[PDB]
């Protein structure tokens, strides 16, 4: 393809894209790309440009674990939109290497889901939703450097950030302007 050819040539320059909703297909693609790029050069940075409306928690936790366990530093770039799991994986970049493009918008909000089934199933899902939401807030508190009480308060409904507000809040480390 053309779009796959431009992405392959930027994969050669160690630039990968989270450019859609973080589902398992895009996550396993990025996890494969981070494993492929950490196998080629384990010392050069991987540039993850994030134009993402968010996505699955477990799909983005696959990416986040592959970002952390890569010996490369994952430079993340908020490009237009880093919402939900996009803001998570943005803030999950290497400290000092989390960038916002100056008109990127950052959406931190608590996870979406759905309960279904019997009341014993839903009691397990909500027990697990409390586990997922506590760990998602713990990591956003670890990434941004904010308290987990402030992360839980701000990420109660949609909490939008500009690039300057995300720099103050702690999702990104720099706003690049070249």
């Amino acid at each position: 393809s053309l779009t796959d050819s431009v992405y392959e040539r930027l994969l050669s320059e160690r630039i990968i894209f989270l450019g859609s909703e973080v589902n398992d297909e895009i996550a396993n693609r990025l996890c494969a790309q981070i494993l492929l790029l950490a196998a080629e050069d384990a010392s050069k940075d991987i540039s993850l440009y994030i134009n993402s409306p968010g996505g699955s928690i477990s799909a983005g936790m696959a990416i986040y674990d592959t970002m952390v366990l890569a010996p490369c530093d994952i430079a993340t770039y908020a490009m237009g939109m880093a919402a939900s799991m996009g803001e998570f994986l943005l803030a999950a970049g290497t400290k000092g290497k989390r960038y916002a493009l100056p008109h990127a918008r950052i959406l931190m909000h608590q996870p979406l889901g759905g309960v279904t089934g019997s009341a014993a199933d839903i009691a397990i899902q909500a027990e697990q939703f409390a586990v997922i939401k506590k760990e998602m807030f713990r990591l956003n508190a670890e990434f941004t450097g904010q308290p987990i009480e402030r992360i839980e308060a701000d990420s109660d409904r949609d909490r939008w950030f500009t690039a300057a507000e995300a720099l103050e809040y702690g999702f990104v480390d720099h706003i690049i302007t070249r």
Binding site: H109, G114, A123, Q125, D156
Partner: protein, 180 residues
């Protein structure tokens, strides 16, 4: 109608899926028969697949409110919501036909309801409040300990009428008037 002849002899008739349409009919039927004869027993025929918890507790509270004792009779099926209404009749009453199928199980959500995890923490605290209320209601009408109801309604518990009498859902299995 044949239903009008049943209602004239003070027999309300559940019959259908317990929803907002069916609960509103039965509560209208229960209060009219309370106004006609408050001392003569209302009979409730139950052939329902159940469903609906607020429609359950609308019917449940009304048949507990009225001065007339409620004689619940399970016809072929009392499956959740309707099995709670079957146990909701007066003690010394609550018949069931010998091949009736009493089905008790914990409340469910029909389909997925979406939302934030704070929205779903409340929809789950409610479905546990619905579950605990369904087990508390089915404990003072069956004589069980609510924790036994919780262990038994963990899954679908289908009761035959002869073992819904042993369970406390009904009090007598209804003998046929002619052998046939």
């Amino acid at each position: 109608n044949p239903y009008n002849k049943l209602f004239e002899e003070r027999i309300i008739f559940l019959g259908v899926q317990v929803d907002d349409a069916s609960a509103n009919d039965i509560m209208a039927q229960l209060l009219v028969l309370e106004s006609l004869d408050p001392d003569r027993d209302i009979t409730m025929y139950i052939n329902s697949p159940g469903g609906g918890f607020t429609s359950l507790m609308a019917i449940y509270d009304t048949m507990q409110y009225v001065r007339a004792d409620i004689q619940t009779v399970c016809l072929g099926q009392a499956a959740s919501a309707a099995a709670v209404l079957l146990a909701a009749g007066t003690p010394g009453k609550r018949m069931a036909l010998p091949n009736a199928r009493v089905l008790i199980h914990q409340p469910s959500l029909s389909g997925v309801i979406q939302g934030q995890f704070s929205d779903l923490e409340i929809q789950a605290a409610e479905i546990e409040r619905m579950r605990t209320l369904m087990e508390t209601t089915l404990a003072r009408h069956t004589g069980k300990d609510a924790g036994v109801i919780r262990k038994d309604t963990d899954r679908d518990k289908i009761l035959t009428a002869e073992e819904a009498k042993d369970y406390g859902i009904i009090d007598t299995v209804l003998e046929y008037r002619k052998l046939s």
